[PDB]
Design a protein around this nucleic acid. Sequence first.
RNA 1: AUUUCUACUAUUGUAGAUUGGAGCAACACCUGAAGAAGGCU
RNA 2: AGCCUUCUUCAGGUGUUGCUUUAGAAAG
DNA 3: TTTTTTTTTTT
DNA 4: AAAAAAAAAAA
Length: 1207
Amino acid sequence: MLHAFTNQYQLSKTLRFGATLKEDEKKCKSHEELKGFVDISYENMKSSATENELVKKCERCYSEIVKFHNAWEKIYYRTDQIAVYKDFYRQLSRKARFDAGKQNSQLITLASLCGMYQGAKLSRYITNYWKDNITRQKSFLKDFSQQLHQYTRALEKSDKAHTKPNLINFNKTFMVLANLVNEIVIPLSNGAISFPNISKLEDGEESHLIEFALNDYSQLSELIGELKDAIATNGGYTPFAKVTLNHYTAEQKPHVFKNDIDAKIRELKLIGLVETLKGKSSEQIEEYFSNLDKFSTYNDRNQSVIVRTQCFKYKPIPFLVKHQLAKYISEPNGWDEDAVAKVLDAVGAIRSPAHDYANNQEGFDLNHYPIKVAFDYAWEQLANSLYTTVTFPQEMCEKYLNSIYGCEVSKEPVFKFYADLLYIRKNLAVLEHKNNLPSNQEEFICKINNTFENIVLPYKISQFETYKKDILAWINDGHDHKKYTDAKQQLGFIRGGLKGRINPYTKLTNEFKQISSTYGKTFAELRDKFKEKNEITKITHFGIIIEDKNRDRYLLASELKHEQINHVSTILNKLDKSSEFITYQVKSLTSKTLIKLIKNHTTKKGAISPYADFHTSKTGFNKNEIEKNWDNYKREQVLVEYVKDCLTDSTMAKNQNWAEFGWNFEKCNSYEDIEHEIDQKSYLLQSDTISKQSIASLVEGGCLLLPIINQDITSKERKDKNQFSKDWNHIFEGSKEFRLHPEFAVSYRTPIEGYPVQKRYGRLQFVCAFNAHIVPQNGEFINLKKQIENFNDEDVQKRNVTEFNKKVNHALSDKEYVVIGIDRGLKQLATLCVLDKRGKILGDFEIYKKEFVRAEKRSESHWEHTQAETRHILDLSNLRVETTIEGKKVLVDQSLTLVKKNRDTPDEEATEENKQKIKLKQLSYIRKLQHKMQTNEQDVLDLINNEPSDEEFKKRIEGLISSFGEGQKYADLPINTMREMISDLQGVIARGNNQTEKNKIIELDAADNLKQGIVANMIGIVNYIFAKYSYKAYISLEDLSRAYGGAKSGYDGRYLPSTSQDEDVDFKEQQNQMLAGLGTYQFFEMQLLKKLQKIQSDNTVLRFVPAFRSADNYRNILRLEETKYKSKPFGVVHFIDPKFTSKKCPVCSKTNVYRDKDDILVCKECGFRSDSQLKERENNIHYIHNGDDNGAYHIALKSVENLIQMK
RNA sequence: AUUUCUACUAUUGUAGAUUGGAGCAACACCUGAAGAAGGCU
RNA sequence: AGCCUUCUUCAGGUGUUGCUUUAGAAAG
DNA sequence: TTTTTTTTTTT
DNA sequence: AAAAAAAAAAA
Ligand SMILES: [Mg+2]
Ligand SMILES: [Mg+2]
Ligand SMILES: [Zn+2]
C-alpha cells in the first residue's frame, strides 16, 4: 500500500550555508547578540586568507624544503637537545604507537624519556617516527624534483613545450610532499619542538644545531601554505577548515584502504604483468609489447586492461600513482623497487611508425604498433600515394587496412573520395603560398580542375556542387574570396569525418572508450587511496553550534594546533546546564568506528591497548582469528555475543553512556545485524549551555565564531521557504530520521574586482558545507556503501528496478490513478497531458499571472496573482509554480508579465517579453559567435567594418552563423550583446593581441546553468501536478535514445551521424550538438528522475523511482513485455517508444496526418482538425490544440493502454 | 539583492530548483611545441 | 637555405556529453 | 506477415 | 517534404 512509497535508502545531502554577514541597509540585521565576536573572528579569518609563476614558486619552495630536510635529518635523533610540549607529546604517543605514561612537567625533554615501553625506550619511538617521516619525505622530494626539473626545462626552452608533465600529478605530488614536510615544520614553528639545552656556549663545535634552532620556520610554513592554497583553489573556492562536531573524531588517523588497494591491483592483474616483465630491459619490454597480437589481445576480456589499452593506443601510467604503486608492490613481493619502476615506466612508451620507418626501414612491421597508431599511419600514407610517390611501406599498409575492413581499401569510393579531397587541398595550398608562388600556376590549376571533374561521390552530398563551383571560380576567374574560403572550410569538414567510414574501426573506437575509461578510473581510485596514507591531519577544528534567544545560530570552532593546552578540553570545560546560550554537539557511533575498535585491540604482555576500555572479559576475543580470519570469524556466535557484550557492558559503553542510543541487540543474530542497529540508532544531538563570558574568553584565545546565514533564516519575517532552511530547522529537532553529519568543511571565495560590495561576488564569502543524512528508521534500511555496490553491477540494478516497480504496480493497480504524458521538443520545451486511466483527457488548470503592487508603506509592496486562463494540455515552457501572499500554490505563466529593461528601476515601465526559450536561443547565438571568434577571427572582425546599422549587422551575421533551428530564422538574435563582444575583441587585438584577454572573450560560455534553471521550472510544475493527484500517477516519457538520421553541427556545418551508423550516437545529444549545446531533453529526464526519488511530505521522504546514481542505471533496464507497446518501467516513470505519437489521429488512429503551418494537426482520412476546438468530442479529444498536444496525448495513451493490459 | 543556480522585483527582497569535494574518459575548438610525409622558391 | 600544406603526438585552457572515488575514533 | 520509417524542426 | 536507413508497429 502507501508504505510501498516510503524511502528505505540512506541519502546524503549537502546544505551549504553562508558564513559572512551582509551589512547592507536593504538586508535585515541578524546575529546581533554576538556581533562583536563575529567581527573579531572575521578579522582573524580575513588575515590568514589569500604556469611560469607557479613553477618559480615551486622551485623556491623546493629549495627551502630541501634545505630544511637536510638540516633536520642530522638533528632529529638528538634526544639530549630536543624537548616537546605535553599535548604534543600526547599526540605523538598516539601517532608513534606508544603509551604516554604520566608526566609531571609541562615541557618534557626527550632525555627524560628513558622509561621502557614494550621493549624500547619512549624517546626511541619518537625518533623512529621522525626517521620514518624523513624517509617518506625524502622519497617524495625525489619524486617532486624529477617533475619540477622536467617542467622547468620544458619552460626554459621554446622547443621543449611538448615535454611538460601532467599538471594534476605535479600538484598532487607537491600536496603529499607539503603534508609530510608540514608534519615537522608546523610543530617546530609553533614551538612544540624546541631546543632548551642551547643557552650554554658550544658555538665552536655545535654551530649546526644552534643555527637550526632559529630559522623562522613561519616563512617556510607561509610559502608551503601559499602553494597549497593556490593548488587547492578550484572553482573560485579555497578550502579553509575541516570542522567536527563529535570530539571523539578530532584526533582521527588516516583511514586504511589496504583491502580496496589490493582488490584494485588484483583487477589490474598488475602483479602478473610485473612478473612477466621484470628481468627484461627497456627494449625487451618494448619487444614484448611489439610481439603481441593486437587484435586478439584487444578483444580478449580476460587480459589486463593495461595490456588491452596498450594495443589500441599508447597510454602511460600516471606519474604519482606509478611511483606510489611500485613502492607498494615491490617490498611485499621481494622485488627491487627500481626493477618494478623500470617495468611501469616502460608501459605505454609512445613510439611512432613514421619515425621508425624514417630511421630504419628493415624489420619494420605495422603489427608492432597499436591499432589506432598503425591505422592512422597506413590510412594517411596510402591516401597520399594515390597521386604521388610516397616513402612508405605500400604493401604492408594495404594489407593492414584490408585486414581491418575485409575489402581492398584503396579501391573503396570513400577512401578514393578522401584521397581526392586531400589532393585538392594540397594543390590549393600550393596556389595559396603567398611567400612563394609557383612559376607555372596552370599545372596546379589543371590538377585541381581534373580532380574535381573526376570525383565520384560515395553518397549524396547536396552542397558539394556549390563548394566545387566556388573553388573552381576563384582559382579560374577569381570572383569572390569569401565563398572560396567557406567552400574550402566545408570541404575540410567533409574530409575530416570521412576517415574510417568505409564500422569495424568505429566498433574498435567505441570499445576503447570503455577500456580507457576503466584504465583511468582504476588508476585514479588507486591514486586517491594512496594519498590517504599521508593525509596526516584530517580534522583541523573542533566546533559546537551556538544558538541565541533570536534563534540565530553560530559555529564556534577551535583550531587543534600544537600548543601547551588541549583545545577540545578547553571548550568542553566551559559548558554548563544553566547558562544563556544553547549549544549543540553530535553524539554518534558508526560501524566504521566499531571495526576500528575491534580489530586494533592489543593483548600482548607488555602493551597497554588504547582500546582496552571497549573490550570486556568475555572469551570472544581472538587476535589471530581477527587479523587473519575476519570474514570467517565474524560469523561465529561467540564473537557476536562478545561484540554485544562490549557494546553493552564495557567501560567505554558506561563512560560514554551508550545506553542513551536505545540499542536492542536481542534480535541481532549476526555481526551485520549489529552493524545495522548501530548505524540506524546511534545518533544524538547533545544540548548544553554556554555563557557570553565563556565565548568571550574563547574568541580571544583563537576560536572562530561564524554566523550561519542564508536568505530566509536571516530575513525580517523568518518563514522557511527554501528546502535547505526547512532541512536546517529540521536538524535541530534532534531526530534520528534526519541527521547532521559531524564533519563538514569551511571554504572561502575571494571577491571579484568590478563587483560592488552590495552583491555577493564583491564580498569575501565564507561557506559552511554541512552534510545531512536521511536514515530510515522504520525497518531494514540500505546504507550508502551497499548502494554503491549495487550501482556498480548492472544485473543487480536490473533486479532492483524490477522488484521496485513490482511493488509500485501492486500499490497502484486497484487505485484510480492517472497517467501524465510529457512530450519534448523545441517549439514547446515540454508539453503535459494528464489522462484518466480509461484514457479521458483531464485538466482545467488555472493559469495565473503576477502584477507587482507598490504600497504606501513601501515595505509592504508585494505581488498579486489573478487567474488569466484555463488550459487543459499544458505547455510547460513559460510556466512556474508560485506561492501567493495568501499561501496558495498556483501555476503562473511568466510570459504574461513584462519585465524591465534595466534592473533596479522602480519608476520605469516594464516593456520586455519573458519567454524562456528565447534565453536558450540567445545563448546558442552567443556560443556560435564565440566559436567563430576562435576559428574565423578575421571574419568576425569584418562584421563591424564601416559601423553598420542593425539590419546590415544582422545580414552580415547570417553569412557566418547558422540559424537556431526553431521559429523564424534569426528571429531573436542578440544584436547588442554580439556587437559589444566583437568590439571588445577588436579592442583587445588593438592593445597588443594578448591571449588571456582574448580567452576571456572567445572561450565558450557554459550553457548548463541556464538550461538547468529553465528545466527546474518545468520540474517544479510536474512535481506540483504529481502532488495534485495525491501521488497516484504514472509518468510517461519518450525513449529518445535513437537517432534515425543525420544532422548538422551547430558550431560548424559538420555532419553528425545517426545511431545506425555509429551505435553510441544518442538522439538527445545529437539534438544538443545541432543546437550548439542548448538541448534540454536529458536535463529534463535527469532532473525529473532525481526529483521523484526524494519527494518530501513535511517530514518524510517518499520514493517513486528506483535508486540510481548514473544515467546507465535508469537506462539499461528491462523492458515490460507481453504488452501492446514497448516500454521501460522505471518506478512510476515509463519510457515508451516515440514512434507514431505525433503522426497519429486522435479520432481514427490513422497515421495519414500532417501538421499545418500553425502547427494545427490535420487528418487526411477523417477530416479531423485541431482548430475546431468548440466541437465537443468523447474523451475530451477537443482539448488537443496542436501537434505537441497530440504528441503528449499519445505519449500518455500508449502508457494507458499498456497499463490496462499489464495489470 | 541569493549557500548556489535560473527568472525577477527594488518588497530590510520574491518564486521555483538545489549534494558537496576531488577527479577520470571520449569529443570539439583554441594556444604552446615535437616528429614524419609531400611540395614551393 | 627559407617557407607552405597535410597527418599524428605531447602539454594546457574552455566547452559538450558521460563515468567513478571520497565524505565518524585504525597498534605489528 | 513483411517492410520501411518513425522522436526534432523551417522554408 | 526532406534528410548519408535501425527496430517498432501500421497496413
Ligand atoms: Mg516527442
Ligand atoms: Mg514536440
Ligand atoms: Zn483521423
